[PDB]
Amino acid sequence: PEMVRGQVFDVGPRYTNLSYIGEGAYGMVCSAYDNVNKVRVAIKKISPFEHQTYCQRTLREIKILLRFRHENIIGINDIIRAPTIEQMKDVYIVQDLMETDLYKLLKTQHLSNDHICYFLYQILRGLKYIHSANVLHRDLKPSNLLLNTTCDLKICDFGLARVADPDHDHTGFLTEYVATRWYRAPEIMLNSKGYTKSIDIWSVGCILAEMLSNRPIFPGKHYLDQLNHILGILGSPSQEDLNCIINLKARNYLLSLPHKNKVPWNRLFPNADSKALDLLDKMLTFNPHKRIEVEQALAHPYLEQYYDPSDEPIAEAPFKFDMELDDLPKEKLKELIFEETARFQP
Ligand SMILES: *CCC(=O)NCc1ccc2cnn(C)c2c1
Known part of the structure; x- marks a missing residue:
């Protein structure tokens, strides 16, 4: 897996050539080339599972953005996570760049x-x-x-x-x-x-x-x-x-x-x-x-x-x-x- 500034950014194979954008309340955000749609995308890494209010905020963002479809509201294009709850420590949200x-x-x-x-x-x-x-x-x-x-x-x-x-x-x-x-x-x-x-x-x-x-x-x-x-x-x-x-x-x-x-x-x-x-x-x-x-x-x-x-x-x-x-x-x-x-x- 690619790392970015002392941090795993584990999004392959689909997404490669990670260019760091910046940190925030939204964790580490990087651009990445999407090898299926053939465009660069934004990917944000979220690690919320220890802190209950982090889980609440993450769940709200995901539930709302997946239900909404509007030109002036950012969509979720993909979500990358481990195949099992036991193995899931992070969630990557992929959006239009x-x-x-x-x-x-x-x-x-x-x-x-x-x-x-x-x-x-x-x-x-x-x-x-x-x-x-x-x-x-x-x-x-x-x-x-x-x-x-x-x-x-x-x-x-x-x-x-x-x-x-x-x-x-x-x-x-x-x-x-x-x-x-x-x-x-x-x-x-x-x-x-x-x-x-x-x-x-x-x-x-x-x-x-x-x-x-x-x-x-x-x-x-x-x-x-x-x-x-x-x-x-x-x-x-x-x-x-x-x-x-x-x-x-x-x-x-x-x-x-x-x-x-x-x-x-x-x-x-x-x-x-x-x-x-x-x-x-x-x-x-x-x-x-x-x-x-x-x-x-x-x-x-x-x-x-x-x-x-x-x-x-x-x-x-x-x-x-x-x-x-x-x-x-x-x-x-x-x-x-x-x-x-x-x-x-x-
Ligand atoms: C709602 C604020 C947020 O998620 N900001 C993070 C962010 C930074 C750069 C960027 C480029 N394309 N997208 C999508 C983002 C999101």
């Missing part, structure tokens, strides 16, 4: 308004499909948006995804949360478990803002600082939006703050298209009930050049996990990962 991701692109490249528009359209087109399956991505951010050399965009990393559950979204103030801080909606810190579709729209708003300036709009340094940043731009919530937060700890925290006025988007983003800023405003609405939904966003004038609901497909059915994954021991989750990956064995 992408040139970059939006995190890397924003570090290095100014985006034209046409590119921002097209990227935003593709993110929302993919999100329409995900939400139509009653799934929440819950960790949308630049590093989870992959792009090929022709700027086709694909959403990746469904490791924190959940089925939507609005009736059980309410929680107390300062409840701990897992998804990436800079892209978290204000309500996460106040009264929300992130079980509604509005959570993803906030992240997309943050991504739009970041495309406009190449800098994160709300770069918080810790849990409550994130809310400081959001209120620093949106200004103090209205009485009506405050009255929607029934929880007294969360309500009174907001009431304790000095009055802050809204920073106009056109002063933060003087070069931005005015239609882009009108849509941005609607995605970065404080009150999640008044926040724009994905299908409304697609229909917004900013996206008129691309909008075509007949070519923005939805999922054939709602998604459901077989059972809750949070209570399952890792030995059941290893067996589930083994079963979910069986279709790729010869």
Whole structure:
């Protein structure tokens, strides 16, 4: 077997000539020549079986990505693993090879308004499909948006995804949360478990803002600082939006703050298209009930050049996990990962 930077990368015979791309939360990722389809592919090595939350995240990614089929969602082309549970220590996920991701692109490249528009359209087109399956991505951010050399965009990393559950979204103030801080909606810190579709729209708003300036709009340094940043731009919530937060700890925290006025988007983003800023405003609405939904966003004038609901497909059915994954021991989750990956064995 080939090794890559002091690590077995055990994918042959089918996949050879491994060129390391980089490490991450996604383990070691390499490109490799696929000797059957005669193209280079991406392959990511996952070693989750010791840690139960690693197993949960791995199983979610696999189950979701295998069920979904959409141009703006990364597919799984193949999964390589040992023929038996006893011998399975790693899983390799094979996907279409992408040139970059939006995190890397924003570090290095100014985006034209046409590119921002097209990227935003593709993110929302993919999100329409995900939400139509009653799934929440819950960790949308630049590093989870992959792009090929022709700027086709694909959403990746469904490791924190959940089925939507609005009736059980309410929680107390300062409840701990897992998804990436800079892209978290204000309500996460106040009264929300992130079980509604509005959570993803906030992240997309943050991504739009970041495309406009190449800098994160709300770069918080810790849990409550994130809310400081959001209120620093949106200004103090209205009485009506405050009255929607029934929880007294969360309500009174907001009431304790000095009055802050809204920073106009056109002063933060003087070069931005005015239609882009009108849509941005609607995605970065404080009150999640008044926040724009994905299908409304697609229909917004900013996206008129691309909008075509007949070519923005939805999922054939709602998604459901077989059972809750949070209570399952890792030995059941290893067996589930083994079963979910069986279709790729010869
Ligand atoms: C969702 C984020 C992720 O999986 N990133 C890893 C990755 C890096 C490079 C690359 C090229 N083609 N694909 C697919 C990837 C994935």
